Amino acid sequence: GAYKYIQELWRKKQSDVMRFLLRVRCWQYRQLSALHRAPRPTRPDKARRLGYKAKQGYVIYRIRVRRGGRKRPVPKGATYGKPVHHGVNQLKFARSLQSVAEERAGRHCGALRVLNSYWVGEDSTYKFFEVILIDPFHKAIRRNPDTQWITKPVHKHREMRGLTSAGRKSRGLGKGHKFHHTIGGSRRAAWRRRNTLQLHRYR
């Protein structure tokens, strides 16, 4: 099939053919609004890998995120605390820029459900991502047993709670000795269980 070629071709983002397309797209995406619907996926292969299926109910928004770190929003620097906290400039956000993208596309279209996102191009000031949305009230989505899990109310705003693939990575969870500080549900689940006196009845 052709999807293997398209996949392995997108693994050559330095080649001349790819460097041309990326700079051409990144030019065109820079002329549109920060958040606008795309008619079809620009990366059909990546979309299918992430769960997109070409059928009524799947929506794709391409949104733009300003690159760079996060500076502490305090007036003129003034962090009236101890010197350990005077940092204003080289601070980094705890969540990826892709996860910020999934959030902004999900907050705008509250009726839809964020599924996944992927990288489609960047420059010195912008990263462009294409988020895959699903309309959980379309009968093509509602009547399909394979995808009707997204319709359940527990998956309202997966991106706001950090449950998408891009959002999960910032939570630092996984199996093994590298991820001890999130044993339990999450980083707060571990902290509670470890800072709770279990005062038994008989001690």
Partner RNA sequence: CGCGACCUCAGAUCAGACGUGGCGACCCGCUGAAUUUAAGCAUAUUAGUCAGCGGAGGAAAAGAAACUAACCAGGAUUCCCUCAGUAACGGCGAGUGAACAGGGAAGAGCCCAGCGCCGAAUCCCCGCCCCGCGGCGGGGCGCGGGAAAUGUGGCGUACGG
Contact with RNA (CB under 7 A) among 11, 14, 75, 84: 84
DSSP bridge pairs for 117: 131
Site for another protein in 149-168 (CB under 8 A): 151, 153
Contact range with RNA by CB under 7 A, out of 16-24, 105-113, 116-124, 125-133: 105-113
Q: Which residues contact 18 (CB under 8 A, 6 or more apart)?
A: 9, 10, 12
Q: Are 138 and 46 in contact (CB under 8 A)?
A: no
Please work out, in degrees rounded to the nearest 5, the angle formed at the alpha carbon of residue 174 by the alpha carbons of 189 and 148: 85
Contact range with another protein by CB under 8 A, out of 39-47, 51-59, 76-84, 145-153: 145-153
Q: Are 187 and 168 in contact (CB under 8 A)?
A: no
Token pair, residue 121, equals 């191009």
* Shortest Å distance, C-beta 129 to RNA: 16
* Shortest Å distance, C-beta 13 to RNA: 19
Count the residues of the shown chain that bind RNA, applying the rule CB under 7 A.
Answer: 80
Pick the closest to residue 72 from 99, 94, 92, 46 (CA basis).
92
DSSP bridge pairs for 60: 38, 132
* Shortest Å distance, C-beta 62 to RNA: 8
Q: Which is nearer to RNA, 11 or 200 (CB)?
A: 200
Our finding on whether 145 is near another protein (CB under 8 A) is: yes
Site for RNA in 62-81 (CB under 7 A): 70, 72, 79-81
Our finding on whether 110 is near another protein (CB under 8 A) is: no
Contact with another protein (CB under 8 A) among 142, 155, 169, 187: 142
Q: Which helix (H) or strand (E) holds 100?
A: helix 97-108
Site for RNA in 111-170 (CB under 7 A): 111, 137, 139-140, 143-144, 146, 153-157, 160-163, 167-168, 170
Contact range with RNA by CB under 7 A, out of 17-25, 122-130, 192-200: 192-200
Token pair, residue 184, equals 């339990």
Pick the closest to residue 166 from 120, 101, 111 (CA basis).
101
Token pair, residue 129, equals 């991502």
Q: Which is nearer to another protein, 75 or 153 (CB)?
A: 153
